[PDB]
């Protein structure tokens, strides 16, 4: 309540002053309260606040519920990873100019899903998990005081909930590797068409995974610090890394950021940043 009062009172600096439109954004210098402000600006500047009549103290309270239900004790899968996933969704919608290709309910759902998609993760060494993450998400969404979708009609609410759930489930990398063949497939034959409801849902999944993974695209000093959190979580349950990093980039990351660059050439900095990191890791791998 002490934290909610400060949060609700504060003025929310512009998207420019917060730097949330940059693919190279980083959160290391922000306090919990500042990521909260960044989050309101994301909602506000996607015009989700007015278009769905969100009340300020509810949105505020909803963000703090989401943040609280990530575990500070987990070195990487925590609020900051979720906050960063949402910042990249924001950036890809704005700077990557993907906003225009989607509808309001899709965008509302993507942002809620990005922020919620790992709720209550306890660490890799501790599609079962994603169903739990969605469960948390919905629970918080229904808590009185946090109900940021209350201004949506029942039909809007039902559509938005379905997309949210699909988007969070899509962050299972096993689901991503199962489905990306089809996605890459349609891009290489210039058959890709967002107006097909199946390809729309497919793209939304792939965009969720690209945001989820996007620490791998950051500028080298930021990305290397994220890598330390990953190594901490995976090893310490709390020489070999450069080749793992190259193996992960090749097996999981590069094609996705390549495909996404075809759907919108303004997402190229994610591909660019991924590429720079691969070469820098490769260099280290050769000792
Ligand atoms: C900047 O790098 C990374 C940024 C983000 C992620 C990841 C992963 C990896 C692979 C890995 C795992 C353990 C170790 Cl020890 C090394 C390498 N690297 C990542 C999987 C975890 N999901 C991620 O969001
Ligand atoms: Mg996850
Ligand atoms: Zn995640």
From Swiss-Prot:
Changing residue 223 to Y: Changes substrate selectivity from cGMP-specific to dual cAMP and cGMP binding and hydrolysis. Residues 1-287 form the PDEase domain. Zn(2+) binds at residues 81, 117-118, 212. 3',5'-cyclic GMP binds at residue 245. Expressed in aortic smooth muscle cells, heart, placenta, skeletal muscle and pancreas and, to a much lesser extent, in brain, liver and lung. The active site is at 77 (proton donor). It comes from the Eukaryota. Mg(2+) binds at residue 118. Phosphorylation is regulated by binding of cGMP to the two allosteric sites. Phosphorylation by PRKG1 leads to its activation. Belongs to the cyclic nucleotide phosphodiesterase family. Composed of a C-terminal catalytic domain containing two putative divalent metal sites and an N-terminal regulatory domain which contains two homologous allosteric cGMP-binding regions, A and B. Plays a role in signal transduction by regulating the intracellular concentration of cyclic nucleotides. This phosphodiesterase catalyzes the specific hydrolysis of cGMP to 5'-GMP. Specifically regulates nitric-oxide-generated cGMP. This is cGMP-specific 3',5'-cyclic phosphodiesterase. It comes from Homo sapiens.
């Amino acid at each position: 309540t002490r934290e909610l009062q400060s949060l609700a009172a504060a003025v929310v600096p512009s998207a420019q002053t917060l730097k949330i439109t940059d693919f190279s954004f980083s959160d290391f210098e922000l306090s919990d309260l500042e990521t909260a402000l960044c989050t309101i600006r994301m909602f506000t500047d996607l015009n989700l606040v007015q278009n769905f009549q969100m009340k300020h103290e509810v949105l505020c309270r909803w963000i703090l519920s989401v943040k609280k239900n990530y575990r500070k004790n987990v070195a990487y899968h925590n609020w900051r990873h979720a906050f960063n996933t949402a910042q990249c969704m924001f950036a890809a919608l704005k700077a990557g100019k993907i906003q225009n290709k989607l509808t309001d309910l899709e965008i509302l759902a993507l942002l809620i899903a990005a922020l919620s998609h790992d709720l209550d993760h306890r660490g890799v060494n501790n599609s079962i998990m994603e169903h739990h993450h969605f469960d948390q998400c919905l629970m918080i969404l229904n808590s009185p005081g946090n109900q940021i979708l209350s201004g949506l009609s029942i039909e809007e609410y039902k559509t938005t909930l379905k997309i949210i759930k699909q988007a969070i489930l899509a962050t299972d990398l096993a689901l991503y590797i199962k489905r990306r063949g089809e996605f890459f497939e349609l891009i290489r034959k210039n058959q890709f068409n967002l107006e097909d409801p199946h390809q729309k849902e497919l793209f939304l999944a792939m965009l969720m995974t690209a945001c989820d993974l996007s620490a791998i695209t950051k500028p080298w000093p930021i990305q290397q610090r994220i890598a330390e959190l990953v190594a901490t979580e995976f090893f310490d349950q709390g020489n070999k890394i450069p080749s793992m990093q190259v193996g992960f980039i090749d097996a999981i990351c590069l094609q996705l950021y390549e495909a996404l660059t075809h759907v919108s050439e303004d997402c190229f900095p994610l591909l660019d940043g991924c590429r720079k990191n691969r070469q820098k890791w490769q260099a280290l791998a050769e000792q």
